[PDB]
């Protein structure tokens, strides 16, 4: 479902904006996998290329959340 990928992207970003990084990471990892399964479901090669940069941009957001979490783990 495309509406699920869009929705799950929205949730990951909302959780991240609110500092709920645990829940954000679950959805970021969810969308990255879900986006990859739809990616190889795409028969068009060009449409596949454009989704790959969406995956890349979402992947960048997920790495920043991890970096924030790693910083927070130092306070322990």
């Amino acid at each position: 479902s495309l509406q699920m990928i869009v929705e799950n992207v929205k949730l990951a970003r909302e959780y991240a904006l609110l500092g709920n990084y645990d829940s954000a990471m679950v959805y970021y990892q969810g969308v990255l996998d879900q986006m990859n399964k739809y990616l190889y479901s795409v028969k068009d090669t060009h449409l596949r290329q454009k989704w790959q940069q969406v995956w890349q941009e979402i992947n960048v957001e997920a790495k920043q959340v991890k970096d924030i979490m790693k910083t927070l783990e130092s306070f322990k």
Partner: protein
Amino acid sequence: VDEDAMSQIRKGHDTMFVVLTSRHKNLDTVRAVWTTGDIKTSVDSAVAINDLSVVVDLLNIVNQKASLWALDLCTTVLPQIEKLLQSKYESYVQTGCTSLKLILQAFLPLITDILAAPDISREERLHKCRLCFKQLKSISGLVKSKSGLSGSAFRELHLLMASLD
């Protein structure tokens, strides 16, 4: 459709990048002050950053760790206080009484709430909480026996420890 789906997802990417990068940078500023050990200026720097989301992130860490910090402090300090309360030097006893009062005032409410509750972090708190309560019950008997002296500090401490008899 793909065009609407991708357009909606990419719409928000730049804002997310800026918010998370700036928040990460601000947390790193605070973390650097924290590792030096200065609690005061690390709280001050978080406020000075003037970003409520950084304050939220840090208070969320404090809120989950504060009781464990207090419990760890208590389980190390209470045996020392017990020695002080048994000293033949009046001033040593007085020092132990003052420190015990502060512990009871500040930390006994937290200890009560932990023992009155329905993963690994909760089990660790409950474990250290039970030891801490064992130490306080031992000190309790010492306090009650010395409240018969006249000696007044032990009667105030006896009152603060009423929830243990």
